[PDB]
Design a protein around this ligand. Structure first.
Ligand SMILES: [Cl-]
Ligand SMILES: [Cl-]
Length: 272
């Protein structure tokens, strides 16, 4: 595809209908040094004259999915700063409401991220649980959760014997539980990684009723010697190509428009 507008149209042609977006942003400490190779030794959260990988990924996916979003409300959260660690998420909206469109998401991000104290450890369980709660509150409307992160979930420091860390186990569990909801999870890897362990994380996830999880390496696509519009389109397509199939599975499995009655009831903290 030549542009993300063509990708948008292709997703519609493949059967995507009303679709909602939730954004989760990794604000752990390693963002300060994982742009060594891929972002000119700047922090991946550096706010400067050109967009950082978080801003770019949000812009591209936000634009691609915008026409499917009826209410244009985009819940947006951070995780891994000093206020949340691996236990919570915080809202990027400072007015106790949801952002109106991806452009406002980007404004909130720019406003808040220089005020954060980047921390750890890294877990995706809180953001996935918040997404489940949002889906349940919506009465089972279809959602895409976009997680943007610069590292896999925190590993055990016992590199000889230590199996799954609490972060790994809780994140895997959340992915499994999430598959009871009409929810697609897209993990976008930014920065240097490494990202060559994702295929094994995928094997470590128990079988689910539908494949609700996908990973895309943003850095590997966006570094290519390719026309920028085409490159952005390649990223959008690589991130979202399974979404129409997953949406169909939520129909087949009787998830769309249905409530479980037992969601995490996870509440976000306000922004620092
Ligand atoms: Cl709220
Ligand atoms: Cl909220």
């Amino acid at each position: 595809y030549r542009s993300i507008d063509e990708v948008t149209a292709a997703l519609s042609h493949a059967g995507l209908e009303s679709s909602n977006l939730i954004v989760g942003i990794d604000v752990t400490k390693s963002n300060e040094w994982t742009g060594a190779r891929s972002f000119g030794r700047k922090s991946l959260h550096f706010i400067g004259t050109t967009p950082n990988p978080y801003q770019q990924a949000i812009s591209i996916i936000g634009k691609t999915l915008s026409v499917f979003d009826e209410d244009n409300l985009i819940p947006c959260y951070g995780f891994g700063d000093a206020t949340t660690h691996d236990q919570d998420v915080f809202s990027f909206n400072p007015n106790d409401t949801y952002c109106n469109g991806f452009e406002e998401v980007l404004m909130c991000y720019r406003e808040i991220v220089p005020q954060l104290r980047l921390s750890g450890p890294t877990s995706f369980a809180p953001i996935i649980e918040r997404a489940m709660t949002i889906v349940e509150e919506s009465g089972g409307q279809y959602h895409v959760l976009l997680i943007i992160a610069d590292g896999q979930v925190t590993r055990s420091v016992d590199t000889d014997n230590g199996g799954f860390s609490p972060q790994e186990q809780q994140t895997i569990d959340a992915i499994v539980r999430a598959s009871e909801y009409p929810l697609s999870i897209v993990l976008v890897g930014v920065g240097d990684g490494p990202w060559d362990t994702m295929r094994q994380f995928d094997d470590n996830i128990p079988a689910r009723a539908f494949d609700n999880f996908q990973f895309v390496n943003f850095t590997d696509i966006m570094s290519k010697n390719i026309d920028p519009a085409r490159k952005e389109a390649e990223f959008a397509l690589s991130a979202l190509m399974e979404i129409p199939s997953q949406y169909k599975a939520t129909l087949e499995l009787g998830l769309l428009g249905q409530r479980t009655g037992h969601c995490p009831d996870r509440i976000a903290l306000p922004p620092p």
